[PDB]
Design a protein around this ligand. Structure first.
Ligand code: CHL
Ligand code: CHL
Ligand code: CHL
Ligand code: CLA
Ligand code: CLA
Ligand code: CLA
Ligand code: CLA
Ligand code: LUT
Ligand code: LUT
Ligand code: LUT
Ligand code: BCR
Lengths: 221, 97, 86, 221, 219
């Protein structure tokens, strides 16, 4: 098969990549395809900080892509939300009747965005200061893969497949990061949801691609 | 068979390029407009059939639906393409020619 | 006229195409068969048949490639007639 | 806590900052709080150029954060000069009588942007190139804090309070850069002056905040 | 003047010796001693930034000449679908295809999708060959291969090859500056490069950049 560590592994240019990989990317870390053509991570501590940035970006982008797909899929299946499209889902706090979570008024019923943001600032500052330092869910642990409170299902045991699960996590995270960038730019240039753009591209793929919106942000006006 | 004393666990020699390349080699040609379909394609009409049959989600497709034709032809060609792709990959890798 | 039409051009093109493919080592001939993997290997030839052609092109070679090219040209012209291109 | 140097110092996460603060941030520089989560300054040459760039950004941001508030601060007293906001202040060059300094017509009252632009280019290229290399007031000294004629009031002596005022300068400068980025985006999103935003916030905070302008940049398409 | 070594062409004139970093000795083309922001201290990052700069320079030379050429040829007699560079892409969706020089039998391309696909295939092959190696050269210099580029044999005599290198990177830095200028002159005006050149050379007093200094004001 194909492996993802060591001197030979899966690389960024594929078969035309044996001369392409840098010297410092020896392949001991998950997701090492050897793509540092701009040389941003030549220093190893810059490389370590960039690995932490990539993995936390990866996990937050996985959560964000699931949360951009989830209420739109539930709206196209059964559920009347407040505003299921993700780039207009923020202003439901200004829908004069509350933010219904699953569309039901028995749910969280939020009406004050300042208190929502404030408890988010408190809880997020607490949890991220726990992530970088330690707290009730583990004090002395790996800053990127803590374990034994974030592995209650024990999938980090047998570490030869924990390396494979690290590569799977970083690969779905990079795909979700690419998909979140696609969500952002598609929101900017189409104004509809990603599933609405998917239904559009599935209806008529010849003109519901990106090139119909190529003249939209024209420099004339 | 003086060899084969343990039934190897890799009895199928899995190359993940094979399913991808079979789906690609059948489906991309399956999206070429032909006038027999009225300018549409086999796979496009298949996705349309699944879209119409997903509307009434619990109940299943009918007998005169024309969804079954697209499904069965698409999967005939698809399984043949994937099967011959695995065969060719493990014939080029192994001997057999 | 027929001689000079699209059908005649396509037919002569296909016939000479198969013939120049067999003559110049690009198609399987009497003296060169193929294996399972389509590599041109030589043949037993099962009788031995002579030819003055420098490469060894035979009357059997031209009959076989004329039949193949005529099938190819027939199919092509009736296809182009079928899709309305002809 | 009365120190801004040494191994133990005030840090950017407070008590959550023991797992942070890597080895090349030692607290030897004014304003070290252990914030290098991106890892941009591992090389001390890169760190030196980033410190110089940060401190000249600090000086220009402390100049800017006061030069943007004083036109609206003298419009508070009622001195009318064309326009009081800073982001529409340049167009007073193209007025019917030109940009006036304090509104009184016997003041600066220049009209041509290109001539004063050329004067600014020549004297600022000369002054900044003397800042980088050296000129008639000190040739080879600190690229950060030259002193000499830059301290005519004698605050550069007694080096402990020099270091203390270095930390004070970089702290007020970082606050000024934060304020100037806030000025830029309050100009972009709201389109009014920052002191006008302060008056609107003090008049009505609960409904007029940033979340009132949260639905402005929504891409309709 | 020598463009290498201790005394060379320097970006702040005759007084820049404090502004020179230690790692910018000048063994590479176009060294003026400008890393005052300090992003290129690591030697491998210096290598990567140099190849980034050179290929940005070459692509911006090609892009500058492609920005100026069909707009200049628009007034020399031949007329295209669109003459300005920022609308030179949108001539696919116009009815009647992308004629190359205006002639309807030259290219006549109506499909942007297969055009981009053929470009993606060929460009992926070219850039994979450029980084790794391929059939027009296997292992050579990453930036200056030879033997298939410069086939006319002007890459020899390494002192004039060094002068050609510094001239190449200086023309390329000028073209990169002008490509950024083309981008901002597109976004603030909407008229092309030589159209703005005629707008400047008609009356330069009001039709300088400050005619468009109030365009992106907020509300
Ligand atoms: C940090 C991640 C984050 C992202 C990506 C968004 C996304 C958005 N919010 Mg949202 N929010 C985010 C955090 C939060 N929001 C809210 C509460 C709201 C409200 C009340 C509203 C929004 C609205 C919006 C939209 C603004 C409309 C627009 O300009 O579209 C154009 C821009 C895009 C489509 C992409 C923008 C992404 C950006 C350019 C690149 C990504 C950079 C990061 C955002 C910066 C990193 C953040 C750091 C500080 C953590 C935008 C899609 C408004 C809305 O949806 O109404 C129609 C709105 O009313 N948000 C809270 C408090 C609970 C947040 C706290 O975490
Ligand atoms: C370098 C600092 C500097 C900044 C931040 C500005 C800012 C501005 N000037 Mg300006 N100027 C500056 C220097 C100078 N100006 C002028 C002469 C003029 C004139 C004649 C006019 C302006 C106008 C404007 C405004 C354009 C309106 C707009 O598009 O809003 C969008 C932009 C914002 C809301 C600010 C966003 C900030 C920005 C995106 C980030 C800041 C980083 C910069 C990219 C880096 C600065 C450039 C560097 C390389 C020097 C804008 C806020 C116009 C105006 O006020 O009328 C509307 C106008 O007519 N300026 C001269 C010559 C003396 C300058 C020399 O120092
Ligand atoms: C001795 C005088 C001398 C000085 C002061 C300079 C300085 C300069 N040289 Mg130069 N050189 C000098 C002599 C020489 N140079 C060179 C060879 C070169 C080269 C090859 C290069 C330079 C470059 C530069 C520039 C780098 C600084 C910069 O990036 O701008 C930063 C400062 C600004 C951008 C301020 C200007 C802004 C303006 C005043 C305000 C306007 C604001 C607007 C309104 C925008 C605001 C936006 C709003 C809307 C937010 C700068 C103009 C580089 C260059 O061209 O970079 C662009 C470059 O590549 N020099 C030679 C040959 C040996 C010289 C011989 O004497
Ligand atoms: C997991 C998905 C799913 C579910 C929940 C159902 C559920 C059902 N199907 Mg459907 N069906 C499915 C997949 C599914 N089917 C697939 C994959 C095929 C192919 C069919 C083809 C099919 C037919 C042809 C018919 C049903 C029918 C039915 C109903 C009686 C059995 C029941 C509600 C019957 C019905 O109610 O109508 C019926 O006639 N199904
Ligand atoms: C320029 C090239 C060219 C073009 C455009 C065509 C075009 C065409 N050919 Mg021709 N053909 C060509 C070259 C070409 N052919 C060559 C080189 C040969 C020789 C091998 C043939 C031999 C050939 C035959 C023998 C037949 C065609 C047929 C057809 C037509 C429909 C095929 C179809 O839809 O079946 C689609 C069929 C299926 C999807 C299922 C088939 C199921 C089978 C029976 C299972 C076994 C179409 C007009 C057919 C025709 O004339 O019908 C009107 C036909 O029978 N072609
Ligand atoms: C462009 C201005 C600038 C620059 C060059 C620096 C550079 C530096 N800072 Mg300073 N800093 C700044 C602004 C800047 N800072 C501001 C505005 C604040 C207040 C929030 C601070 C607060 C601060 C603290 C508390 C500390 C530093 C430290 C450092 C050093 C290491 C960190 C690093 O790698 O930063 C590199 C930074 C850059 C290359 C600048 C990149 C600018 C990007 C574009 C910003 C992008 C973020 C976002 C889009 C904009 C802001 C969003 C939101 C916060 C509003 C380095 C010398 C640490 C140190 O060693 O002390 C000397 C330290 O302890 N800084
Ligand atoms: C993106 C294009 C690009 C890139 C990668 C570089 C990269 C480099 N340049 Mg070049 N340069 C460029 C554009 C570029 N330059 C342009 C447009 C000019 C003309 C103004 C110059 C003029 C120039 C001179 C005169 C010198 C260099 C030098 C250098 C080296 C060190 C400086 C550094 O850290 O740059 C890092 C660059 C980046 C991180 C690119 C970021 C792009 C930002 C977003 C642009 C922001 C401003 C607009 C490095 C190899 C020095 C050198 O080593 O010579 C061999 C030197 O002496 N450059
Ligand atoms: C490698 C390399 C190399 C060389 O050397 C250089 C270079 C080139 C530079 C490099 C590259 C890089 C890259 C590619 C980058 C990218 C990134 C990204 C895209 C990210 C994202 C990232 C992204 C992310 C995180 C995201 C996240 C998201 C989220 C949370 C979301 C959320 C949400 C939701 C749910 C929905 C609602 O309604 C709202 C909101 C709020 C909206
Ligand atoms: C530290 C760290 C760490 C980690 O690790 C990483 C990271 C994150 C990257 C980092 C961070 C960073 C940051 C925060 C940055 C920011 C910056 C800024 C904001 C600057 C500004 C800066 C800013 C500045 C200078 C500003 C300046 C200003 C000015 C001059 C102004 C002027 C003016 C005035 C007066 C008024 C008039 O009428 C007009 C004008 C002309 C308008
Ligand atoms: C040196 C240094 C130093 C210190 O330390 C720091 C700092 C400051 C950071 C640095 C700097 C940097 C810079 C300046 C950069 C810049 C760059 C650029 C501008 C690029 C462009 C670049 C540019 C480019 C490539 C361009 C390209 C172009 C092309 C391809 C083409 C295009 C075109 C044409 C014509 C055709 C049609 O019609 C359209 C189009 C498609 C449109
Ligand atoms: C003497 C010589 C020459 C020439 C020669 C020639 C010119 C030859 C030709 C040849 C040819 C020109 C041949 C042809 C052949 C043909 C053929 C052999 C045909 C056949 C046909 C067939 C087989 C048919 C079949 C079919 C039918 C009947 C119907 C439909 C189906 C199919 C198609 C199957 C050269 C070079 C000058 C020089 C030296 C020697």
């Amino acid at each position: 098969g194909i492996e993802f560590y060591g001197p030979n592994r899966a690389k960024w240019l594929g078969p035309y990549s044996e001369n392409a990989t840098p010297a410092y990317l020896t392949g001991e870390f998950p997701g090492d395809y050897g793509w540092d053509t701009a040389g941003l991570s030549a220093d190893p501590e810059t490389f370590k900080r960039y690995r932490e940035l990539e993995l936390i970006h990866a996990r937050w982008a996985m959560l964000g892509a699931l949360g951009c797909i989830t209420p739109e899929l539930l709206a196209k299946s059964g559920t009347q939300f407040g505003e299921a499209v993700w780039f207009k889902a923020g202003a439901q706090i200004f829908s004069e009747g509350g933010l219904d979570y699953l569309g039901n008024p028995s749910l969280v019923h939020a009406q004050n965005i300042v208190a929502t943001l404030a408890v988010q600032v408190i809880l997020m500052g607490l949890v991220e200061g726990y992530r970088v330092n330690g707290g009730p869910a583990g004090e002395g642990l790996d800053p990127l893969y803590p374990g034994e409170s974030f592995d209650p299902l024990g999938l980090a045991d047998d570490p030869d497949t924990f390396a494979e699960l690290k590569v799977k996590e970083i690969k779905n995270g990079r795909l979700a990061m690419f998909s979140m960038f696609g969500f952002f730019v598609q929101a900017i240039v189409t104004g509809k949801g990603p599933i609405q753009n998917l239904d559009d591209h599935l209806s008529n793929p010849t003109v519901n691609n990106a090139f119909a919106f190529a003249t939209k942000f024209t420099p004339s006006a | 068979e003086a060899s084969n004393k343990s039934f190897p666990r890799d009895w199928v020699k899995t190359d993940p390029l094979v399913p991808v390349l079979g789906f690609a080699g059948w489906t991309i040609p399956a999206n070429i407009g032909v006038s027999a379909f009225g300018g549409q394609s086999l796979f496009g009409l298949f996705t349309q059939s699944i879209g119409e049959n997903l509307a009434h989600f619990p109940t299943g497709p009918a007998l005169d639906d024309k969804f079954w034709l697209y499904l069965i032809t698409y999967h005939l060609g698809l399984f043949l393409t994937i099967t011959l792709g695995q065969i060719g990959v493990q014939g080029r890798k192994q001997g057999y020619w | 006229g027929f001689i000079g039409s699209s059908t005649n051009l396509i037919m002569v093109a296909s016939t000479t195409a198969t013939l120049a493919a067999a003559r110049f080592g690009l198609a399987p001939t009497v003296k060169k068969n193929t294996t399972a993997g389509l590599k041109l290997v030589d043949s037993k030839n099962s009788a031995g048949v002579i030819s003055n052609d420098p490469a060894g092109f035979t009357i059997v070679d031209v009959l076989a490639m004329g039949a193949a090219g005529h099938g190819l040209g027939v199919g092509i012209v009736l296809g182009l007639k079928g899709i309305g291109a002809l | 806590a009365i120190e801004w140097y040494g191994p133990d110092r005030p840090k950017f996460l407070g008590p959550f900052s023991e797992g942070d603060t890597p080895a090349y941030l030692t607290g030897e520089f004014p304003g070290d709080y252990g914030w290098d989560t991106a890892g941009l300054s591992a090389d001390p040459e890169t760190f030196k150029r980033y410190r110089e760039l940060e401190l000249i950004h600090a000086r220009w941001a402390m100049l800017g954060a006061l030069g943007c508030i004083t036109p609206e601060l003298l419009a508070k007293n009622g001195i009318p000069f064309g326009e009081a906001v800073w982001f529409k202040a340049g167009a007073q060059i193209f007025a019917e009588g030109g940009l006036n300094y304090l509104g009184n017509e016997n003041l600066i009252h220049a009209q041509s942007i290109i001539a004063t632009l050329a004067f600014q280019v020549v004297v600022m290229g000369l002054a900044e190139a003397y800042r980088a290399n050296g000129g008639p007031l000190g040739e080879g000294l600190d690229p950060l804090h030259p002193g000499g004629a830059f301290d005519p009031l004698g605050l550069a002596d007694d080096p402990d309070t020099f270091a203390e005022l270095k930390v004070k300068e970089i702290k007020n400068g970082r606050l000024a850069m934060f304020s100037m980025f806030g000025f830029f985006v309050q100009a972009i999103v709201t389109g009014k002056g920052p002191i006008q935003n302060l008056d609107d916030h003090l008049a009505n905070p609960t409904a007029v905040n940033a979340f009132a302008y949260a639905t402005k940049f929504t891409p309709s398409a």
